[PDB]
Amino acid sequence: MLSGLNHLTLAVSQLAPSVAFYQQLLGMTLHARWDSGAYLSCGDLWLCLSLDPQRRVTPPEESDYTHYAFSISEADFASFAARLEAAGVAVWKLNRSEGASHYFLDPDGHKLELHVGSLAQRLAACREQPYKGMVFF
Amino acid sequence: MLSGLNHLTLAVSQLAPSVAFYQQLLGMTLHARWDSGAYLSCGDLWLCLSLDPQRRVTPPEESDYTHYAFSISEADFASFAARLEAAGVAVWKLNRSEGASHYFLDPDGHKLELHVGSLAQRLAACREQPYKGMVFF
Ligand SMILES: COC(=O)COc1cccc(CN)c1
Ligand SMILES: [Mn+2]
Ligand SMILES: [Mn+2]
Numbered sequence: 001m002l003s004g005l006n007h008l009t010l011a012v013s014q015l016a017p018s019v020a021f022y023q024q025l026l027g028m029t030l031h032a033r034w035d036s037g038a039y040l041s042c043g044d045l046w047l048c049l050s051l052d053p054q055r056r057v058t059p060p061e062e063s064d065y066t067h068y069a070f071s072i073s074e075a076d077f078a079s080f081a082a083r084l085e086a087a088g089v090a091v092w093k094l095n096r097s098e099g100a101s102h103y104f105l106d107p108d109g110h111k112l113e114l115h116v117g118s119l120a121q122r123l124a125a126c127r128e129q130p131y132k133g134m135v136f137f
Numbered sequence: 138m139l140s141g142l143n144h145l146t147l148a149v150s151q152l153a154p155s156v157a158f159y160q161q162l163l164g165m166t167l168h169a170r171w172d173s174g175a176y177l178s179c180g181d182l183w184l185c186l187s188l189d190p191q192r193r194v195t196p197p198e199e200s201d202y203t204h205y206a207f208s209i210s211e212a213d214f215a216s217f218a219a220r221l222e223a224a225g226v227a228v229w230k231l232n233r234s235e236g237a238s239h240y241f242l243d244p245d246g247h248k249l250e251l252h253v254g255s256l257a258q259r260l261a262a263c264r265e266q267p268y269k270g271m272v273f274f
Contacts, residue, residue: 001164001209001213001217002163002164002165002179002180002207002208002209002217002251003179003180003181003207003208003209004179004180004181004182004207004208005142005145005179005180005181005182005205005206005207005208006206006207006208006250006252006254006255007206007252007256008142008145008205008206009202009203009204009205009206010203011201011202011203026139027138027139028139030274031256031260031273031274032260032263032271032272032273032274033270033271033272033274034267034268034269034270034271034272035268035269035270035271036268036269036270037268039256039259039260041256042139042140042141042142043139043140043141043142044141044142044181045141045142046255046256050202052201052202054200054201054202055201055202055203056201063191064148064189064191064192064193065146065148065187065189065191065192066146066147066148066187066192066247067146068142068145068146069142069143069144069145069146070139070140070141070142070143071139071140071141071142071143072138072139072140073138073140076138080139098185110203113143114139115143115144117143118183119144119168119176119178119183122176123168123169123176126169130171131171131172131173131174132171132172132173133171133172134169134170134171135169135170135171136168136169137167137168137169137170
């Protein structure tokens, strides 16, 4: 059967600024770079940045809610979010509708998130503060 | 410090067919559902389906290369691909890289992939046959 995300591939319009964003600003590990892409890791996540002439820099009001959240500890969350803010990283959401999260944009407008907590922790929180019509299986 | 992918959220135009696709067709575990979304798991992956009227059913020619690959064993790959084909799931690309890959579309046109092989496997193949301009770190 299926088990896990094997990799996340993001189409990027300009490879160098995107590599810099994920490696330098977000601290991911850069393993390889070539004329049309890069491979990075973030813990167990395999991230591929793929140069794509079709990628557009997309304002957040023009894209749907599809987004990619990265895990961070409770101890590190606030200072990492504040560092992104001070670096001028654009945002896309302010209301914490799914727990402790910071919502920010990559250079192409990919919707990213820092989040503290696992699925199990979110289900437990939702039992007390459920989303409308929520059912647990 | 970021420690991995916390969750992947896909915006969906119709919640019921999307739940059917990820839970019943792809075999992911449904943990909760509410009026505007669902939480599923696939191995370590926390998947959120979020009902979003902004989501367009998007032909693959109209979206960029951003895509989401799920892990499957080599032994299970061909029968899972055949399951998707029996269900009528469209393919958006043929495999031309190392490691088995099946490139298929979700009901809203999200670009998905089944892939066999890790980052380490890809890096080893690339060391032997580097892509154009490839540098390792
Ligand atoms: C001269 O330009 C650079 O050095 C930019 O950084 C790269 C570093 C590694 C690989 C590539 C792609 N060949 C570019
Ligand atoms: Mn999220
Ligand atoms: Mn892929």
